[PDB]
Structures are given as structure tokens and as C-alpha cells.
Amino acid sequence: QPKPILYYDERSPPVRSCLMLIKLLDIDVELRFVNLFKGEQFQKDFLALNPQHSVPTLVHGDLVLTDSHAILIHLAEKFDEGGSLWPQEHAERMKVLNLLLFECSFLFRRDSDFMSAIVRQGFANVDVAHHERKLTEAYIIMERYLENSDFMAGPQLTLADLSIVTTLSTVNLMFPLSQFPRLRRWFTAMQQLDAYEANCSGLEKLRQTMESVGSFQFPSSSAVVT
Amino acid sequence: PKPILYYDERSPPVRSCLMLIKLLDIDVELRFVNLFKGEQFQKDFLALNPQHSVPTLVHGDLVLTDSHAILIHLAEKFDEGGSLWPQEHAERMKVLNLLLFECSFLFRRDSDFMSAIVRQGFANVDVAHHERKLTEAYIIMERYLENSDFMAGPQLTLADLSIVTTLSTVNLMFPLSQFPRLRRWFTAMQQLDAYEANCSGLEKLRQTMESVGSFQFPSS
């Protein structure tokens, strides 16, 4: 019943997906900033709330959620009851769930491995070709999904698109989409949604933070901008 | 049409699905895909699942490529109204939150360790690094068990089935002796009839890892 509280750092793509859903559904939510690059997620009180030391973390009454994909489903079920973002029909809902788990286990995992290598080693010491292969593989899979539909999980916008677009925009700071016409079309369409504005500041903050910590510049030509 | 499960029982996410199939008496058709021979890269399997992973379930026209989606789908279709995937929203969110901890944290870190063994050889893995990453997962689970007998509340749910198989896999290398709640919970899980579905693939994974990584686990 009390309004949700979101612990967040907008540089995180999963955080941005929750910010996008909050904007799309017009949800009133208290924001509490946790600076991941300063290690504020290791403060004792935050660790007591979420021992995984991660954002987004949502506190909604007694419920404490520590994964973006649970937060997206929870907020859709509470603030979009009966809607199409988290579909009513079982098969369509399982397709969206399957895509959310692809984002967690495959796209995000590989982008996190790459970006954490940059922070830990410096960009000049990362095997960028290795990560390019891993992440281009994810682009190929997404292009294949979109060869069948204009959205990731079917013919309409779902939570899968909100979860995937933020991490895709993050991978695309580095790796261009010139060779992926369906992924370009979809990303352009997602950027026309008013809710996409919630992605913009955090993407830019992540770009700047990574350039500083990793001592490099992303190639400006890569990012798709409309 | 009955569900088809593409599987290699060495995979802990596969074992979680085998455990649920045994608990719910689901009639499935099993099709083996050998992960250590690279059969997940065969062209027909890749056409089905471009993430080249098991478990993969084909149920009618529905193709699921992640164990946590498979667990939820099978519970919804074959255990409607049961307690493994709770009806009440807050309880269900708690289960979902733990399934995603398993995917994003426990499994990710065990995968990173076990992959390192296969790629580099055990003698060349930074075991102390992986011990810190995996012990941190043990610490988190010990905290999750502070208030309840099971991972997501007072009774067995899908979260326990997902977590127990990967935990048993981490436990090939790293003992539970420092984590009393977690050790008690693991012993209780081993007493379930359905836990028998974990045993064969866990031992096969032990043997395959010891051969490929040229070592013996401490627990061996």
C-alpha cells in the first residue's frame, strides 16, 4: 500500500528499464540513489536490505525485490493489472518471461563481463575482440527474434522490450548496428516512445564514467541516435 | 503433445527441471544433447535455441530456453493452484526474486568457475578468486534462510529446486561447514524423494570435470 521505493543508479541498464516502466505507467515512486562506482552498495544498511549489493532494489511495503526482472513484473502486475506488457495469455506471458531471462543470462551477462573488464583492467588491456564476438552473437540472436515480429516477444510492446533496450543501448555505445537492419528498426522505434527518455541521462552518465575509469573513448559513430 | 525436454543432466538447471518433473509426475520426452561434445552447436539445435543452452523445452508451439521459465511453465500447467509457484502475488514475487538470484548470481558465479576449469585446467584457475565469489553466494543464502525453513518462505517452492542443484554443484568444491542454516537446508532437501533426480547428473558432472580439468575435487 505505501508507495514503492526504488534504490537506483541510472548508469545501470536494468535500473533504466525500471525507470522506463515507471515513466510508461506513470507510477509514483520514491528514488534513493546508491552510487555503484563509489561502492555505496557495500554500506552496512544497504547490504542488510540487499546482500547481493545490487540495483535496482525495490521496497514495496514488506516486499523487497533485488532483480530488475522481478521489479518489472511486480510493477506491471500492480500498476498495469490486466494489461499487455505482462500478457494475460499464458503462452504469450511465457514468451515474455523467456526473453527477460535471455536479457539476464545472455545479453546482460556478456555486457557486464565486457564493461567490468574495462573497469578492472583499463580499456587498453581488455581483449576487445573477444567481447565483440560474444556481444555480436547476442546481436545476431536478437536480429533473429525480430525477423519474426516488430517487438522482442511478439507483435506488441512488452516488458521484454523495456528490459532489452537499455542493455542494447549500452552494448551499442561500443558496437555498431549497421549490419542489423531489424535491430536498428526496433531500436529506432523504441527511441520514439516517450518512456525512452528515461534511458537517456543514465546512458550518458555511464558513457562518461566508463571513459574516465577505463581511460578511453567509445567510438561516437556507433551509438544509434534519433 | 507432451513436452519435449532437451537435456544434459550434468547441467544444474537441467537437474532442477528433472526434479520438478519427478515431483509433479510429468510425462515428458527426454532428448539428450551432449554439452561437453558441443552438440548444442549443431545446426538443428541452434535453429531451435540460438542461445545453445539446455534445458530447452518444446511444448506444443512454445519453445522455452531458460530453466526458470521452464519451471514456471510446468508448475502453471501441471500444478495449477499448488504451492511450488504460489498463487498469492507477494509470495510469488518472492519465489521469482530467488529464481533470479539463482540465475544472475549463484549460477553466473558457478558457471564462471567451472568454465575456467574447463578452459584453463584446474591447476591454472584462480581458485581463491572463485572461492570468494562463491562463498559470498553462500553468505547471501545463509541470510535468506534467517527467517524461513526454505529459500522463499515456510515451504518448498520452485526457488529451492532451482537453487539446490547449483548449490550441490558449488558444494563439489566448497564445503558448507561454515553455514549452519544452509547446511541444514541442503540436508533437508536431500531427504525429498524428488531430490533423487539430482544425483546421477551431479556425479556425472563430478567425473567429467575431474577428467577434463585434470584434478580431483576435495569432496571426492
Residue numbers in the entry:
A (entry chain AA): 3 to 228
B (entry chain BA): 4 to 223
Copied sentences from the primary study:
DmNobo forms a polypeptide homodimer with a canonical GST fold, which has a well-conserved GSH-binding site (G-site) and a hydrophobic substrate-binding pocket (H-site) adjacent to the G-site. Consistent with the requirement of GSH for GST function, a defect in GSH biosynthesis in D. melanogaster also leads to larval lethality, which is partly rescued by the administration of 20E or cholesterol. These data indicate that the nobo family of GSTs is essential for ecdysteroid biosynthesis by regulating cholesterol trafficking and/or metabolism. In general, GSTs catalyze various reactions with an activated glutathione (GSH) molecule in the following three ways: GSH conjugation to a substrate, reduction of a substrate using GSH, and isomerization.
GSH and EST binding did not affect the overall structure of DmNobo; the root mean square deviation (RMSD) values for each pair among the four crystal structures were comparable with respect to the estimated coordinate errors.
